Swiss-Prot record, chain A:
Changing residue 5 to F: Abrogates phosphorylation and stimulation of transcription by ABL1, and increases the interaction with RASD1/DEXRAS1. The lineage of its organism: Eukaryota, Metazoa, Chordata, Craniata, Vertebrata. Component of a complex, at least composed of APBB1, RASD1/DEXRAS1 and APP. Interacts (via PID domain 2) with APP (with the intracellular domain of the amyloid-beta precursor protein). Interacts (via PID domain 2) with RASD1/DEXRAS1; impairs the transcription activation activity. Interacts (via PID domain 1) with KAT5/TIP60. Interacts (via the WW domain) with the proline-rich region of APBB1IP. Interacts with TSHZ1 and TSHZ2. Interacts (via the WW domain) with histone H2AX (when phosphorylated on 'Tyr-142') and the proline-rich region of ENAH. Interacts with MAPK8. It is found in: Cell membrane; Cytoplasm; Nucleus; Cell projection, Growth cone. The modification Phosphoserine is found at residue 68. Phosphorylation at Ser-68 by SGK1 promotes its localization to the nucleus. Phosphorylated following nuclear translocation. Phosphorylation at Tyr-5 by ABL1 enhances transcriptional activation activity and reduces the affinity for RASD1/DEXRAS1. Polyubiquitination by RNF157 leads to degradation by the proteasome. It comes from the Eukaryota. Changing residue 116 to F: No effect on phosphorylation by ABL1. Highly expressed in brain; strongly reduced in post-mortem elderly subjects with Alzheimer disease. This is Amyloid beta precursor protein binding family B member 1. It comes from Homo sapiens. Residues 1-124 form the PID domain. The modification Phosphotyrosine is found at residue 5. Transmembrane segments: none annotated.
Swiss-Prot record, chain B:
Changing residue 16 to G: Loss of binding to MAPK8IP1, APBA1, APBB1, APPBP2 and SHC1. The chain holds residues 742 to 768 of 770 of the full protein. There is a cross-link at residue 22 (Glycyl lysine isopeptide (Lys-Gly) (interchain with G-Cter in ubiquitin)). Changing residue 16 to A: Little APP internalization. Reduced amyloid-beta protein 42 secretion. A motif (YENPXY motif) lies at residues 16-21. The modification Phosphothreonine is found at residue 2. The modification Phosphotyrosine is found at residue 16. Residues 15-27 are annotated as: Required for the interaction with KIF5B and for anterograde transport in axons. It comes from Homo sapiens. This is C31.
Length: 124, 27
């Protein structure tokens, strides 16, 4: 079906379902569905690229090695991941997924798994 | 418990810590 990019917000910690549900509640409170940006995520072990639906304009690109955490929200449509934007600086990227966030969350976990193996292969 | 719902509940309850970041962090 369809993914919507909800945007991103700073967060205080690199990990935690509490942190991502906090971020999702803030963003959900301050936007209406009409404002949500239709999009899709190009997932690779190196990077995730968030692309606008028709135009394919780049809305973000995130390196998988600095993704610290990801989760599905308490509402099953929600997906979020936390990026270590810097050593002590964390940014949460959030999505609404129809029919639910399962396939996208699992793709992004899979990128992290393959990227991690690369890190081990690099130093074997 | 469908195959979806098991992985799905874990994704909600626990999420997932990227071992790449945890690896590259220790060093």
């Amino acid at each position: 079906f369809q993914v919507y990019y909800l945007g991103n917000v700073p967060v205080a910690k690199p990990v935690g379902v509490d942190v991502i549900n906090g971020a999702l509640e803030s963003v959900l409170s301050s936007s209406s569905r009409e404002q949500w940006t239709p999009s899709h995520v190009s997932v690779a072990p190196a990077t995730l690229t968030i692309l606008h639906q028709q135009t394919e304009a780049v809305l973000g690109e995130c390196r998988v090695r600095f993704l610290s955490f990801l989760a599905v929200g308490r509402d099953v449509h929600t997906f979020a991941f936390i990026m270590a934007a810097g050593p002590a600086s964390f940014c949460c990227h959030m999505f609404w997924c129809e029919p639910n966030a399962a396939s996208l969350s699992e793709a992004v976990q899979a990128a992290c798994m393959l990227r991690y193996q690369k890190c081990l292969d690099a130093r074997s | 418990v469908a195959p979806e719902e098991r992985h799905l509940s874990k994704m909600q309850q626990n999420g997932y810590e990227n071992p790449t970041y945890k690896f590259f962090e220790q060093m």
